[PDB]
Scaffold this active site. Sequence first.
Site, PDB file in Angstrom:
ATOM      1  CG  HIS A   1     -48.708 -11.263 -23.165  1.00  0.00           C
ATOM      2  ND1 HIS A   1     -47.372 -11.032 -23.431  1.00  0.00           N
ATOM      3  CD2 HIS A   1     -49.172 -12.007 -24.198  1.00  0.00           C
ATOM      4  CE1 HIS A   1     -47.050 -11.600 -24.579  1.00  0.00           C
ATOM      5  NE2 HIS A   1     -48.123 -12.199 -25.064  1.00  0.00           N
ATOM      6  CG  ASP A   2     -47.670  -6.195 -18.720  1.00  0.00           C
ATOM      7  OD1 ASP A   2     -48.270  -5.379 -19.453  1.00  0.00           O
ATOM      8  OD2 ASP A   2     -47.943  -6.337 -17.507  1.00  0.00           O
TER       9      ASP A   2
END
Length: 299
Positions: free
Chosen positions: A106-107
């Site tokens: 994920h970011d």
Amino acid sequence: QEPGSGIGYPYDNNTLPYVAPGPTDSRAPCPALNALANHGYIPHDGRAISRETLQNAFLNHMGIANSVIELALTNAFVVCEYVTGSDCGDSLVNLTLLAEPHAFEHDHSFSRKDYKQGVANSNDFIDNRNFDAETFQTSLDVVAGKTHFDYADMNEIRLQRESLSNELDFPGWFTESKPIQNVESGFIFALVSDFNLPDNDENPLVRIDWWKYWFTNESFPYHLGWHPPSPAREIEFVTSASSAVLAASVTSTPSSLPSGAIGPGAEAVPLSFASTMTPFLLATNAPYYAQDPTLGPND
Ligand code: HEM
Ligand SMILES: *[C@@H]1O[C@H](CO)[C@@H](O[C@@H]2O[C@H](CO)[C@@H](O)[C@H](O)[C@H]2NC(C)=O)[C@H](O)[C@H]1NC(C)=O
Ligand SMILES: *[C@@H]1O[C@H](CO)[C@@H](O[C@@H]2O[C@H](CO)[C@@H](O)[C@H](O)[C@H]2NC(C)=O)[C@H](O)[C@H]1NC(C)=O
Ligand SMILES: *[C@@H]1O[C@H](CO)[C@@H](O)[C@H](O)[C@H]1NC(C)=O
Ligand SMILES: *[C@H]1O[C@H](CO)[C@@H](O)[C@H](O)[C@@H]1O
Ligand SMILES: *[C@H]1O[C@H](CO)[C@@H](O)[C@H](O)[C@@H]1O
Ligand SMILES: *[C@H]1O[C@H](CO)[C@@H](O)[C@H](O)[C@@H]1O
Ligand SMILES: *[C@H]1O[C@H](CO)[C@@H](O)[C@H](O)[C@@H]1O
Ligand SMILES: *[C@H]1O[C@H](CO)[C@@H](O)[C@H](O)[C@@H]1O
Ligand SMILES: *[C@H]1O[C@H](CO)[C@@H](O)[C@H](O)[C@@H]1O
Ligand SMILES: *[C@H]1O[C@H](CO)[C@@H](O)[C@H](O)[C@@H]1O
Ligand SMILES: *[C@H]1O[C@H](CO)[C@@H](O)[C@H](O)[C@@H]1O
Ligand SMILES: [Mn+2]
């Protein structure tokens, strides 16, 4: 460490030496998996890994019980299928595929750059898998000058990382991922909280030096007094810590924060990908390994 050194005794009586990864070895965007592979607890080349090998490596060498990685296991195999195009059965092709963006990876990570962080063209992408010292530094700054930190501090750290990523990522890329990230927040408290303190189970405090060693070196901080938690941590501790972090009161709100960043998060659930969807290309960068200094077999 070398088996005969007795460094992990009496918590881990069967240790193996650290061996730096080579240009051809497969590594992941996970500091826990990389440390295990560097020691050969899981294949040193990071390929063909079974669930059971993962479960035993975690339990026996990191003090992490099976319940903790139940969902992580499921998601790892779901991503393997999505990326390779076929069911991976009980043989995870490699660790590198775990860095498939906008999936399990994920970011706004604590120590890795985002897939499209600071790129001039929409078609560009960068290394969102290897440890990035500068990115980790932005996490450490939040707790500069301290030796320990609590749930409230961790909430500040994740907030700073979200703000930075939301601003630096190519327009339209950033996607908040609180459920997965905060299970990872829980992972951190589960592994490196200070068990020498009287009320570690109710109010755990992370030891920053232990955290730095683990992330930067991708090996275990035995030289710093660390040892696998005993008894092994269970999922209960992790989700509770995850919840406590998101509930912690914020005393400093960063700018350009994504909508709804502050507040409770949904519980993590197994991933699912549309058959119509094609996966993003994986960064092909060689495996990162500590160079200043390089580690010896007992480090
Ligand atoms: C078989 C189980 C596991 C799998 C498949 C797995 C997978 C991953 C992946 C794909 C990421 C996401 C990278 C990101 O976007 O930040 C990651 C990050 C991370 N993992 Fe694991 N992991 C597992 C178990 C663990 C455990 C048990 C620990 C430690 C107790 C751990 C600690 C971390 C941490 C702290 C991060 C975040 C690093 C950062 O944000 O910079 N992992 N892992
Ligand atoms: C990465 O690992 C190395 C090796 O264990 C760490 O270096 C040791 O650090 C302590 C404190 O700086 C010294 O007293 C030791 O003598 C060092 N050993 C060597 C060979 O230099 C290093 O600190 C770790 N990195 C991080 C960020 O924790
Ligand atoms: C890990 O597995 C993935 C999936 O097989 C490999 O990625 C593919 O590699 C081939 C050959 O280099 C490329 O044609 C594909 O485009 C890659 N897929 C994606 C989604 O990028 C990857 O090379 C393997 N990595 C390592 C280090 O073994
Ligand atoms: C390590 O060895 C000692 C002595 O043989 C034993 O008491 C201890 O329980 C062992 N540790 C583990 C995790 O088996
Ligand atoms: C960690 O776990 C808690 C409790 O499941 C979630 O609310 C949070 O979003 C993160 O997944
Ligand atoms: C953390 O949260 C999970 C589910 O969100 C529970 O199973 C666990 O007992 C702990 O409360
Ligand atoms: C759930 O469990 C964690 C870790 O034991 C606690 O810190 C939290 O207060 C809640 O009881
Ligand atoms: C999830 O769990 C933590 C620990 O019990 C709470 O502090 C939080 O308010 C949420 O209910
Ligand atoms: C939540 O509570 C803290 C103190 O615990 C305040 O300082 C903060 O501003 C927030 O309202
Ligand atoms: C208010 O308190 C939190 C931790 O409780 C800090 O991280 C923040 O910087 C502010 O001083
Ligand atoms: C208060 O502290 C937070 C976390 O350190 C910052 O992101 C914010 O900009 C403010 O300085
Ligand atoms: C910064 O601002 C946010 C939103 O106004 C608060 O929730 C936080 O407590 C801090 O004061
Ligand atoms: Mn990431």
